[PDB]
Structure formats: structure tokens, C-alpha cells
Design a protein around this ligand. Structure first.
Ligand code: CHL
Ligand code: CHL
Ligand code: CHL
Ligand code: CLA
Ligand code: CLA
Ligand code: CLA
Ligand code: CLA
Ligand code: CLA
Ligand SMILES: CCCCCCCCCCCCCCCCCC(=O)OC[C@H](CO[C@@H]1O[C@H](CO)[C@H](O)[C@H](O)[C@H]1O)OC(=O)CCCCCCCCCCCCCCCCC
Ligand SMILES: CC1=C(/C=C/C(C)=C/C=C/C(C)=C/C=C/C=C(C)/C=C/C=C(C)/C=C/C2=C(C)CCCC2(C)C)C(C)(C)CCC1
Ligand SMILES: CC/C=C\C/C=C\C/C=C\CCCCCCCC(=O)O
Lengths: 158, 62, 37, 220, 34, 60, 257
């Protein structure tokens, strides 16, 4: 949990650092940014042709990541310092043994469900919540809405 | 309104610094976590209240 | 750039990303203080 | 009556019940001319099958006569009022709206309907044959309790009378449903439309004159 | 040229299947451990 | 043209299979090896003098 | 023979009352943040829904706890009914039905001069209720007053209810002030003590959720100005574009860089 908090902390801090050092007279790739282009491809604060129009969503994302990192770090510090040392007798649902195949498979299934939910959350953005940036859109690249995704087995297997 | 928002943000920063420096010290002392729980709980509550207040006040200064 | 209301706090932002490296160094310092038992 | 040696029979004064039909169960008119119920186990299975078929047939007959009557009277408006064309409304542009207004069901997918029906009906039938939330050791065919909220069958004699009435009504419903199926198959029209056409000209509109001469070598 | 492709495909799939089904045949039990 | 060639480079075929003959070769060889391996699994497992219950395998 | 069973086959009930009653019941804070010794001694895990949550020492003794439990149960049931009847008609009218005064804080104003309140007996027929405002208020006041006077009297007239049957004015004896049962329980779900206890816990939790929901309804109506269904629909359509922070900003914000 502490390591996850560290990851979220880096994400938020780097987003804030990159958004505070951004000038509009130069393109994104000319200023050494690597996290901002990730949010641009999701259709946040960009316009037709690929010109940055707004900056506030990047700030919002960075702030949210930083505060969530604070919460995660507190949780990790608690669970690592004063929490239960071995949670196989007080919390049987969360307890496990490395050699117990059924419990490990159950945990794997739970996290698979979580990852599938994350993928579906990405899918919902391109359909209903404004769409994502499409660089092949007619009349120049722009934030489109994907209405007819390709779910053909031959295309996916290709 | 801008001055109030900046004061709230500074208070949030100082409370966060106090929590960062104090929580490990309280948790890493023998029989210190089991006694000084009220201070940590109040600090966490003040931290959450300050972050919510800053979020609310951001809508007027931006 | 940061919004005009967050301008005074720019120096705080400029030093944030080094904290994970500081965390690794702090782990080493804690091990040293414990005397590498 | 309705039980014992003095019950009415399925042929009238010409009564000759088999040896295994003692008149112990509802709807026992002594009609087994094929000996299909000589084994008591098969007799019990057939009794359960008959009762379940009766109940399903009553529900189906009511559900096949209601929407068409409503649409023909002009009270409501459906995408397809005929009973053998109600399933194709899910393929229409507007979906399937209950009684015509788009604020009631507005069903759009056939896969979702299929999966939900599979899960729900499987669970409730497993409850019926094993026991579930509404009971664990009740009767197989007449459980009662939660399924008899307002007690109508509490006196044992009234229970038997209601059993007989239910079985006879369900048998009439089964015959009506078989007629519905065959008779929309031949005429390609709803039961109410067929009834209206017959009531218009009973001699001209029928089965024999209308379709019988075209039942060998000519189209219908 | 198609015959050469078929022959090479057969050889490659033969060896790869041998590898897979040999490593599936209770390999972590062929050790001198007590 | 002047000559003939397979002409499959840079096409994007599944597993490079431009021919049912290639598909059949792959499938037949894999099935033969799998069938030979299948019948020996009971004997191989019995070499460890243990039953293949839920506690089988190399564990720590 | 039994009147209850599992929903998932044979031997699939597994009712665990030790999670909601007794010394091992779940509290309002995890075991690492609050020891079980800090709980008010009056809250001994006997009433349903007891999470051991009483910060402002409001449970002095058993009598005050019982009175507050009666008030809480009444409020929870009314909150259930209010939340359902305030969220459903508005969605019905927004999806394409003909409902007048769908929004909950406008139905009273709908029948002011000569307006009539259509009633939708879903899904069969939409009625044309012709009762005027004065008749409506008189009938509602009379019925509610009679029912609530019966409740406080702990007695009632003779009638007939399904399950129990035709009852005289004597069935009301030994009837609980909060869980009367009998005529009010026709389906007979309150026959197993374990099932009854878990149903009580479920009821109290759903009631607390409904209370919080209607408080949110009132605050949303005060602030945003439209019905609860409209807020939900607009937020689901645009999560980051329609929320409290977006609504609070009374003017559009200039683009940052
Ligand atoms: C999806 C889960 C599901 C499960 C697990 C069961 C399970 C069961 N059902 Mg149930 N049902 C389920 C869904 C449904 N059932 C029914 C309606 C019935 C009836 C009416 C009966 C059962 C009965 C039974 C029991 C034995 C059935 C059997 O042997 O198959 C037999 C296998 C077949 C494939 C049947 C083939 C159909 C049949 C030969 C005639 C079909 C005729 C044509 C459709 C023509 C009709 C057109 C005319 C009317 C116009 C068994 C416990 C029977 C029972 O044992 O009663 C005591 C019983 O009589 N079920 C419906 C309504 C369509 C369901 C879903 O919608
Ligand atoms: C032994 C049984 C029996 C069989 C196999 C047939 C067979 C046939 N009949 Mg006949 N019939 C039979 C008894 C009877 N038919 C009729 C009166 C008719 C008529 C009026 C007509 C037929 C015709 C037909 C043909 C199909 C029509 C139909 O299904 O309705 C008959 C109903 C069966 C119960 C079919 C070749 C039709 C025909 O040949 O068209 C050129 C036609 O027009 N049948 C009567 C009333 C006296 C019968 C009484 O038992
Ligand atoms: C549960 C308590 C209750 C609550 C919270 C409200 C709440 C409200 N009423 Mg309602 N009413 C309530 C019971 C009753 N009202 C009315 C009849 C009315 C009328 C006639 C009117 C309201 C109006 C209003 C709104 C004015 C403030 C407000 C949202 C008024 C308004 O203009 O709403 C916008 C309005 O005109 N109410 C009756 C008589 C049937 C009630 C009880 O029987
Ligand atoms: C990553 C997974 C994770 C897991 C498996 C556990 C597991 C456990 N925790 Mg820990 N914990 C975590 C993270 C995690 N924790 C975090 C991030 C925090 C900081 C808030 C804590 C703080 C914490 C406390 C204070 C306590 C425990 C204790 C326990 C036990 C559960 C009993 C309970 O009452 O907790 C419930 C704890 C909650 C925080 C409340 C529920 C909050 C809901 C579930 C969150 C909904 C958010 C949703 C999942 C979205 C998350 C975003 C995601 C994408 C990152 C169990 C051993 C308890 C124990 O008894 O220890 C002795 C206890 O005292 N944990
Ligand atoms: C059913 C209950 C349950 C649930 C809901 C979760 C859920 C979660 N666990 Mg798991 N976990 C469980 C049981 C459960 N766990 C048990 C019993 C154990 C044994 C103690 C663990 C051990 C465990 C560990 C050790 C860790 C987690 C972590 C996490 C989080 C990973 C997702 C993430 O990284 O975001 C990114 C991925 C996404 C797809 C985006 C979120 C999209 C939302 C969910 C939709 C997630 C919140 C990891 C973590 O993140 O901790 C904070 C972590 O390090 N889990
Ligand atoms: C034997 C069982 C039975 C079955 C399988 C059907 C099946 C059907 N009915 Mg019929 N019907 C029946 C009996 C039955 N009916 C009876 C007894 C009546 C008299 C009340 C009706 C009156 C009737 C009407 C008035 C309508 C239908 C319609 C329909 C179709 C749409 C289903 C739907 O939207 O409802 C799903 C909705 C429900 C209310 C389920 C309850 C929701 C739970 C409780 C939550 C479908 C072909 C509709 C149509 O398409 O007509 C052509 C329609 O308008 N039916
Ligand atoms: C907290 C209590 C509560 C209150 C005060 C209201 C209040 C109101 N509702 Mg809401 N409602 C509620 C909860 C509540 N509702 C619940 C729980 C639901 C179901 C989820 C609904 C669903 C609903 C609908 C569908 C509609 C309303 C509407 C309205 C209005 C009624 C208009 C009317 O014509 O009614 C006439 C009502 C009746 C004649 C009452 C019939 C009730 C029967 C008689 C039950 C009594 C049972 C008894 C045992 C019967 C035995 C007799 C037997 C022998 C026959 C009014 C503002 C209407 C509207 O237009 O508002 C915008 C409307 O369309 N409500
Ligand atoms: C749960 C559903 C339910 C239903 C369907 C009924 C249905 C009925 N009740 Mg009962 N009743 C119930 C619960 C119910 N009750 C409850 C909870 C109470 C409170 C204890 C009563 C108290 C009661 C009284 C006091 C009377 C009835 C009467 C009636 C009958 C006459 C209908 C009437 O006059 O108005 C329909 C318009 C009817 C069969 C009446 C009766 O029995 O004799 C006339 C009557 O006087 N009921
Ligand atoms: C996926 C299941 C894996 C199960 C276990 C596998 C064990 C493997 C053991 C080792 C085998 C290594 C040698 C393999 C040789 C045969 C393949 C070959 O030469 O193909 C060479 C052929 C070339 O095919 C060419 O195609 C052309 C048209 O496109 C023409 O037709 C040419 O004539 C034709 O030769 O390529 C393929 O068959 C494509 C293989 C695609 C494999 C996708 C795997 C997806 C799942 C895994 C994803 C991760 C993969 C690793 C990524 C990171 C790597 C650092
Ligand atoms: C256990 C352990 C460890 C580890 C640890 C860890 C890993 C931790 C983490 C932790 C964490 C991970 C934490 C975090 C925190 C955070 C915080 C505390 C935050 C804050 C924030 C803020 C305050 C913000 C602000 C702002 C805003 C709001 C807006 C804009 C501006 C600014 C930015 C100013 C070690 C290695 C030592 C070793 C030993 C053991
Ligand atoms: C007995 C019937 C049961 C199962 C058989 C089912 C499906 C068989 C289907 C296909 C077999 C041939 C596969 C050919 C793959 C593509 C080859 C190519 O790309 O040329």
C-alpha cells in the first residue's frame, strides 16, 4: 500500500511540475513533457489540429492524484507500523498461505475483475463522456466520439 | 475572497507538514499509538476539512 | 502555468518530484541508524 | 360427487373406468384408453405434468387474448397485437414498449432478455422442485402457505372442489391454446379476428367451406 | 517454395510442441532433493 | 510479370498461415504430440509415489 | 417442513447473527481505530442496527434508548416511502409519461387553483383523479389522524386482513409498539427468529440510507433548483461537466493558457 501511494504521489507531483512549466508558444513535444500528452490523447484541454486550449483539467488531475497519494501513504504507514503482523487469525477473509492454491486463485480473480472494470472505464470515455482525440478524423485531428467500435473476431485476432 | 483562499491553502500546507512529521513519530513509539489517538484523529479531521474548504473556495478564485 | 490564484505556491511545486528518491535515501538512513542489525 | 365410485365419467352413462382409476385425484373422469398410467410412478409424474401444463395454458390463453382485444377495441396501441407476432417487436426501430408508451419497458436487446429469463426462471423452477425461500417441505403441486395469501382453500372439502375447478378450467385452457396455435397456423390471423369473421357470416366464414376444398392440390 | 514452407512449419511446430509438453510433464520433480 | 512468388511479406496474416496446408500441418503435428503425451501422464505422476490431490506439486 | 430456506440450492442459508448481535458485532470503526471498551455501556448489542455509534452521549439509559429507537424506526419507514415516491414519478414523467407536477417540491403547488393530480397505476392505466384540493386535504387529514390515534392508543377496530383473517378488537393486545406483526404481516415472513432478526437489521439499514437520501434530496432542491432525477441524469450524462463545483461557479471561467 505504501508503494502504491508512492506511485500515485509521483504521478501527481510530476503532473503539477509539468503543468507549471508549460508555455503556449511551443508544442508539447518541444518542452520535455511525458505525462501531459497522455491526458491530451484522452481529449482533455485540446482543440482541432492538436493545439492546447485549456490547462485546468491537468491541474485537477494532479491535485486529485496528490491527495489520493496522501491517503494511500497514511494507510500504508499504518498497516506497516502498528497494524496486525500476520492477518491469518483475526481476518480469515484477507489471510492467505502461499501454498494454498484456492486462495491465491481467488485473489487473482478479484484483481482480474478490477482490471476488467478499469478497461471498461476507459471504453466509456470514448463513447459517452466526450470521446478521445482522433488524429485521423476528417478535416484534421479532433476529439471525436467512437460510435462503431470494431468487435470482429477476425480483426481482433489479426 | 482571494486572500481567504490563499490563507486556507497555507493552513492546509502547514497542517500537512505537521501530519507528515508527526504521524510516524506517534506510531513508532512504544505505547504511544494507544494513548495519543485523539491528536492524530483531530489532525486528520482538520486536514480533510481544510482540503474540502480549499476545493470549495477554488470555484470562486478560478 | 498554474492558475493565477496558485502563483505564490510555485516554488513548492518545483521541488516535489525528488521525494521518492529522498524516500529511498531515508530507508538507507534508517537502516544505518538501526546499525544494520 | 367428483370423487369415489359415483363420480361423473368421461363417456356418460356408458361408464367403464380402469382398475387403477379409483377416483382419488381431481379431474378423474376415468379416461385412460391407452394404459399409459398403469404404473403408479408414471401416473404421479403425469399428474404433475398435467397440472403444470394446465396452469401455464391458462396464463398463456389470457395473455394471448388480452392485448389483441385491447388493440381491436381501440383502447391501446401496440407494435404487434397478434399473439404469434408479439415476439418480433424487439426487432423494430422503437424497441418493445409496454402498451405502447415509451416510458414503461422500452426493451431493446434480445440477448439481455434471454439471459435474464434463463437465470430467473431456472432459479424459480429449482425452488419449485427443491424448495427455497417460500418453503422447504411443502407439497409438490399444492404447496400453499406463501402462495395462498388470502386463504381460499382451508376447509378440506373446499380444497378438493377448488382442485377440480382448477383442473377443468386448465384443461379447457389447454384445448383453447391448441386451437389458437393450429388455427392461427391455418388462417394466419388472430383468434379475435377469426371470431369476428365467423360472427359476421357463420355460414360463409368457417373451416370446411373456406379451406377444406383447397387442402389437396390447391393453395390455401 | 510452398513445399519448403510446409516442411519448415512442420519441423518448427514439432520441436516447439516437444518443448511445451516436456516442460508440462512434471518437470519440477526431477531433482536430487530429499 | 517475369516470374512468380508467394507474395506474403507485410500482409498481416494470422500466424503467417496463407494456406490450409500449413494450418493442417501445424494442427496434425501438435495433436500427435499431445496425444502421445496424454496417455503417459498417469504413469509419470506415479513416479513420485504420491497422489495428484490438491496438495500435489513443488511447494514451499 | 419449513417456511424459509436458502436462495441458492440445498443448504445455502447460513444465517450469521453473531455479526450483528452480541460482543463480536461490527462497530462503526475498524478494530484498529477503536477498542470495544470505548462503546457506551447502554449499547450492548441487543437492538438491531446497533453499530455502537453514540458520540454525544445521548443514550442516558434504557428508556431514552427505547424512545429514540421508536422515533428512528418511524422516521426510517417514512423516509423509505418518501424517497421512493419522490424519485419514481419524476423519472416516469421524464422518460415520456404524462404526469403533472412530477417534481416532488411542486406537486403541492400543482393543485392550487383547479389543477388535478393524475395517478399512474403502472403499467396498466393512467387515472384522472378528480378530487379537489379541499377534499384531498380533508380526507388525508382524517385518515392520518385516525391511524395515528390508533397507533398511540394501542388499540383498533375490527376488520379482516389476509393471513390472520377476520380479527376483532382483541388482536391488538400484546402487539409490539414497533413490530406489531399479525395483521400487518400477511405473508408471514416474520416466523423464524433468525430471519426476523436479519430482516430487522436490513430494514433499519435501508431506513438510515433513505433518511440520508431524503436529506440529500432537500439540499439538492434548495441549491441546484431541479428535481433529484434531473440531477442524476445530468451528472451521469456529464460527470465532470455537471457537479457541485461546476454549479457553484456563477460565471464561465476564462481558459488557462
Ligand atoms: C431455464 C431453466 C428452466 C429449468 C431448469 C426448468 C426445469 C424444469 N421444468 Mg420448466 N424449467 C425452466 C424454464 C421454463 N420452464 C417452463 C415451463 C415448464 C412446463 C410447462 C413444465 C416444466 C417442467 C420442468 C421440469 C422438467 C422439464 C424437462 O424434463 O424438460 C423437457 C425438455 C424439453 C426440451 C421440452 C420440449 C418441448 C415439448 C416437447 C413441447 C413443445 C411444444 C411446442 C412449443 C409447440 C407449442 C405451440 C402451440 C402451443 C401454439 C424441470 C424441473 C415440466 C414438469 O416436470 O412439470 C411437472 C412441465 O410440465 N417447465 C418455461 C415456460 C416456457 C420456462 C422458461 O420460460
Ligand atoms: C379417416 C380420417 C380422415 C382422413 C385421414 C381424411 C383425410 C383428408 N380429408 Mg377428410 N379425412 C378423414 C375423415 C373425414 N373427412 C371429412 C370431410 C372432409 C372434407 C369436407 C374435406 C376433406 C378433405 C381431406 C383432406 C384434408 C382436410 C382435413 O384435414 O380435414 C378433414 C378432417 C379430419 C378430421 C385429407 C386428404 C378435403 C379435401 O379432400 O379437399 C379437396 C375437404 O375438402 N375431408 C369428414 C366429415 C364427414 C370426415 C369424418 O370422419
Ligand atoms: C411531509 C411534509 C410536507 C413537506 C415537507 C411539504 C413541502 C412543501 N410543500 Mg406541501 N409539504 C408537505 C405536506 C403537505 N403539503 C400539502 C399541500 C401543499 C400545497 C397546496 C402547496 C405545497 C407546497 C409545498 C412547498 C412549499 C415550501 C414545499 C416543498 C406549496 C408550493 O407552492 O410548492 C412549490 C403549495 O402550493 N404543499 C399538504 C396538503 C395535501 C400536505 C399534507 O397533507
Ligand atoms: C489495498 C488494499 C487494502 C487491503 C486489502 C486492506 C486490508 C485490511 N485493512 Mg487496511 N487500509 C488500506 C488498504 C487496504 N487495507 C488503506 C488505503 C487505508 C487508509 C484508509 C487502510 C486503513 C486501515 C485501517 C484504519 C484499518 C485497516 C484494517 C484492515 C483490515 C480490514 C478491516 C476493516 O475494517 O477495514 C476497513 C477500512 C477502510 C479504509 C474503510 C472502507 C473504505 C471502502 C472499502 C473504500 C471504497 C473505495 C474503493 C475501493 C476505491 C479505491 C480506489 C482504488 C482504485 C485505489 C484488513 C486487514 C482494519 C483492521 O482492523 O486492522 C487492525 C483497520 O483498523 N486498514
Ligand atoms: C474483493 C475484495 C478486494 C478488492 C476489491 C481488492 C481491490 C484492490 N486491491 Mg486487492 N487484495 C485482496 C482483496 C481485494 N482487493 C486480498 C484478500 C488481498 C490479500 C491481503 C489483497 C492484496 C492486495 C495488495 C497487496 C494490493 C492490492 C491492491 C488492490 C487495488 C488494485 C487496483 C489498482 O492498483 O488500481 C489501478 C488499476 C485499476 C484498473 C484502476 C481502478 C478502476 C476501478 C477500480 C474501476 C484494488 C483497490 C493493490 C493496491 O493498489 O493497493 C492500494 C495492492 O498493492 N490488493
Ligand atoms: C404466461 C405468461 C405471459 C407471458 C409470457 C406474456 C408475455 C408477453 N406479454 Mg402478455 N399478458 C399475460 C400473460 C403473459 N404475457 C396476462 C395474464 C395479461 C393480462 C394482464 C397480459 C397482458 C399483456 C399486455 C397488456 C401486454 C403484454 C405484452 C407481452 C409481451 C411483452 C412482455 C413485457 O413487456 O412484459 C414485461 C413487464 C412486466 C410487467 C413484468 C413485471 C416486472 C417485475 C414484477 C419487476 C410478451 C410477449 C405487451 C405487448 O408486447 O403486447 C403485444 C403488452 O403490452 N401482455
Ligand atoms: C410518503 C408517502 C407518499 C406520499 C405522501 C406520496 C404522495 C403522492 N404521490 Mg407518491 N408514491 C409513494 C409514496 C408516497 N407518495 C410510493 C411508496 C410509491 C410507489 C413506489 C409512489 C408512487 C406514486 C405514483 C406512481 C404517483 C404518485 C403520485 C403522488 C401523488 C398522489 C396522486 C394520486 O392521485 O394518488 C391517488 C392514490 C390512491 C387512490 C391510493 C391507492 C392505494 C391503495 C388503495 C392501497 C391501500 C391498500 C389497502 C390494503 C387496499 C384494500 C382494499 C381492497 C379490498 C381493494 C401524491 C403527491 C402521483 C403523481 O402524479 O404525483 C406526481 C403518481 O402518479 N406516487
Ligand atoms: C395487506 C393488505 C390488506 C388488504 C388487502 C385488506 C383488505 C380489506 N380490509 Mg383490512 N386491514 C389491513 C390489511 C389489509 N386489509 C391492516 C394492516 C389493517 C389494520 C389492522 C386492516 C384493518 C381493516 C379494518 C378495520 C377493516 C378492514 C376491512 C377490509 C376489507 C374491506 C375493504 C374496504 O372496505 O375498503 C375497500 C374500499 C378488505 C378485504 C374492512 C372489513 O373487514 O369489514 C368491512 C374493515 O372494516 N381492514
Ligand atoms: C501464445 C501461447 C504461448 C504458449 C507457450 C509458447 C512457448 C514458446 C517456446 C519458444 C518458441 C520460440 C520460437 C518460435 C518460432 C515460431 C514462431 C515464428 O517463427 O513465427 C514466424 C511467423 C512469420 O510468418 C510469416 O508471415 C508472413 C505474413 O505476415 C508470411 O506469410 C511469411 O511467409 C511467414 O513466415 O510469425 C508468426 O507465426 C507470428 C507469431 C505471432 C505470435 C503472437 C503471440 C501472442 C501471445 C504472446 C504475446 C507475447 C509474445 C512475446 C512478446 C515479447 C518478446 C520479447
Ligand atoms: C514503511 C517504511 C518505509 C516506507 C514509507 C513510504 C513509502 C511512505 C510513503 C508515504 C506517502 C506516499 C506519503 C504521501 C504524502 C502526501 C501528502 C502529505 C500530500 C500533500 C499535498 C498537499 C499539501 C497539496 C497541496 C496543494 C494543493 C492542494 C493544490 C496545488 C498546490 C499544492 C501542491 C500546494 C521506508 C521506505 C521509510 C522504510 C521503513 C518502512
Ligand atoms: C464433428 C464436428 C465438430 C467440430 C468441428 C467444428 C469446426 C471445424 C472448423 C474448422 C476446421 C478448419 C479450420 C481452418 C482454419 C483456417 C485455415 C485457413 O486460413 O486457410
Amino acid at each position: 500500500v505504501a508503494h502504491a501511494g508512492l506511485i500515485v504521489f509521483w504521478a501527481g507531483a510530476m503532473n503539477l511540475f509539468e503543468v507549471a512549466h508549460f508555455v503556449p508558444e511551443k508544442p508539447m513535444y518541444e518542452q520535455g513533457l511525458i505525462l501531459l500528452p497522455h491526458l491530451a490523447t484522452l481529449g482533455y484541454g485540446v482543440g482541432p489540429g492538436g493545439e492546447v486550449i485549456d490547462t485546468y483539467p491537468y491541474f485537477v488531475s494532479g491535485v486529485l492524484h496528490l491527495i489520493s497519494s496522501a491517503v494511500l501513504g497514511f494507510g500504508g504507514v499504518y498497516h506497516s507500523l502498528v497494524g496486525p503482523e500476520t492477518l491469518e487469525e483475526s481476518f480469515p477473509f484477507f489471510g492467505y498461505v502461499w501454498k494454498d492454491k484456492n486462495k491465491m486463485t481467488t485473489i487473482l480473480g478479484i484483481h482480474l475483475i478490477v482490471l476488467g472494470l478499469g478497461a471498461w472505464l476507459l471504453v466509456w470515455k470514448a463513447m459517452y463522456f466526450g470521446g478521445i482525440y482522433d488524429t485521423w478524423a476528417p478535416g484534421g485531428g479532433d476529439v471525436r466520439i467512437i460510435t462503431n467500435p470494431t468487435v470482429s473476431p477476425g480483426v481482433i485476432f489479426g | 475572497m482571494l486572500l481567504i483562499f490563499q490563507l486556507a491553502l497555507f493552513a492546509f500546507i502547514v497542517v500537512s507538514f505537521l501530519l507528515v512529521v508527526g504521524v510516524p513519530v506517534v506510531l513508532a513509539t512504544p505505547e504511544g499509538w494507544a494513548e495519543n489517538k485523539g491528536t492524530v484523529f483531530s489532525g486528520i479531521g482538520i486536514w480533510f476539512l481544510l482540503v474540502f474548504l480549499v476545493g470549495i473556495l477554488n470555484s470562486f478564485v478560478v | 502555468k498554474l492558475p493565477e490564484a496558485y502563483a505564490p505556491f510555485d516554488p513548492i511545486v518545483d521541488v516535489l518530484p525528488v521525494i521518492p528518491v529522498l524516500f529511498l535515501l531515508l530507508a538507507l538512513v534508517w537502516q544505518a541508524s538501526v546499525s544494520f542489525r | 360427487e367428483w370423487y369415489g365410485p359415483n363420480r361423473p365419467q368421461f363417456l356418460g352413462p356408458f361408464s367403464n373406468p380402469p382398475s387403477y382409476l379409483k377416483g382419488e385425484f381431481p379431474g378423474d373422469y376415468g379416461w385412460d384408453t391407452a394404459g399409459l398410467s398403469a404404473d403408479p410412478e408414471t401416473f404421479a409424474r403425469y399428474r404433475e405434468l398435467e397440472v403444470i401444463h394446465a396452469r401455464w395454458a391458462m396464463l398463456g390463453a389470457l395473455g394471448c387474448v388480452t392485448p389483441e382485444l385491447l388493440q381491436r377495441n381501440g383502447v391501446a396501441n401496440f407494435g404487434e397485437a397478434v399473439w404469434f407476432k408479439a415476439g418480433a417487436q424487439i426487432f423494430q426501430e422503437g424497441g418493445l414498449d409496454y402498451l405502447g408508451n415509451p416510458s414503461l419497458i422500452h426493451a431493446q436487446s434480445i440477448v439481455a432478455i434471454l439471459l435474464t429469463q434463463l437465470v430467473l426462471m431456472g432459479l424459480i423452477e429449482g425452488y419449485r422442485v427443491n424448495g427455497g425461500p417460500a418453503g422447504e417441505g411443502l407439497d409438490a403441486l399444492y404447496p400453499g402457505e406463501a402462495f395462498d395469501p388470502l386463504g381460499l382453500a382451508d376447509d378440506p372439502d373446499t380444497f378438493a372442489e377448488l382442485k377440480v375447478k382448477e383442473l377443468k378450467n386448465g384443461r379447457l385452457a389447454m384445448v383453447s391454446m391448441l386451437g389458437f396455435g393450429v388455427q392461427g397456423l391455418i388462417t394466419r390471423k388472430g383468434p379475435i379476428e377469426n371470431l369476428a369473421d365467423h360472427l359476421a357470416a357463420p355460414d360463409a366464414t368457417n373451416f370446411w367451406v373456406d379451406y377444406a376444398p383447397k387442402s389437396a392440390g390447391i393453395g390455401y | 517454395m510452398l513445399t519448403l514452407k510446409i516442411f519448415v512449419y512442420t519441423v518448427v511446430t514439432f520441436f516447439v510442441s516437444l518443448f511445451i509438453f516436456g516442460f508440462l510433464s512434471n518437470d519440477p520433480g526431477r531433482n536430487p532433493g530429499q | 510479370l517475369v516470374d512468380d512468388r508467394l507474395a506474403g511479406e507485410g500482409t498481416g496474416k494470422i500466424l503467417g498461415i496463407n494456406d490450409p496446408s500449413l494450418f493442417w500441418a501445424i494442427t496434425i503435428v501438435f495433436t500427435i504430440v499431445w496425444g502421445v503425451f496424454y496417455v503417459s501422464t498417469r504413469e509419470i505422476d506415479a513416479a513420485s509415489d504420491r497422489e495428484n490431490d490438491d496438495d500435489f506439486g513443488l511447494t514451499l | 417442513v419449513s417456511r424459509s430456506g436458502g436462495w441458492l440450492g440445498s443448504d445455502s442459508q447460513n444465517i450469521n447473527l453473531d455479526k450483528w448481535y452480541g460482543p463480536d458485532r461490527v462497530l462503526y470503526l475498524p478494530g484498529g481505530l477503536l477498542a470495544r471498551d470505548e462503546i457506551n455501556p447502554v449499547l450492548n448489542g441487543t437492538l438491531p442496527g446497533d453499530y455502537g455509534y453514540d458520540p454525544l452521549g445521548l443514550a442516558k439509559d434504557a428508556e431514552t434508548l427505547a424512545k429514540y429507537r421508536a422515533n428512528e424506526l418511524l422516521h426510517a419507514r417514512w423516509a423509505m416511502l418518501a424517497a421512493a415516491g419522490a424519485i419514481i414519478p419524476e423519472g416516469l414523467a421524464a422518460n415520456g409519461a404524462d404526469v403533472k407536477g412530477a417534481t416532488w417540491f411542486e406537486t403541492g403547488a400543482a393543485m392550487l387553483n383547479g389543477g388535478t393530480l393524475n395517478w399512474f397505476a403502472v403499467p396498466f392505466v393512467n387515472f384522472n383523479n378528480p378530487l379537489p384540493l379541499f377534499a384531498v386535504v380533508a380526507i388525508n387529514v382524517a385518515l392520518m389522524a385516525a391511524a395515528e390515534n390508533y397507533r398511540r392508543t394501542e388499540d383498533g377496530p375490527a376488520g379482516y386482513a389476509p393471513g390472520v383473517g377476520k380479527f376483532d378488537e382483541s388482536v391488538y393486545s400484546n402487539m409490539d409498539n414497533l413490530y406489531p406483526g399479525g395483521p400487518f404481516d400477511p405473508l408471514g415472513l416474520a416466523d423464524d427468529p433468525e430471519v426476523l432478526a436479519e430482516l430487522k437489521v436490513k430494514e433499519i439499514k435501508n431506513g438510515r440510507l433513505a433518511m440520508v437520501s431524503f436529506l440529500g434530496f432537500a439540499v439538492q432542491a434548495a441549491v441546484t433548483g431541479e428535481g433529484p432525477y434531473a440531477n442524476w441524469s445530468k451528472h451521469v450524462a456529464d460527470p465532470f461537466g455537471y457537479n457541485l463545483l461546476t454549479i457553484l461557479s456563477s460565471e464561465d471561467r476564462a481558459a488557462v493558457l
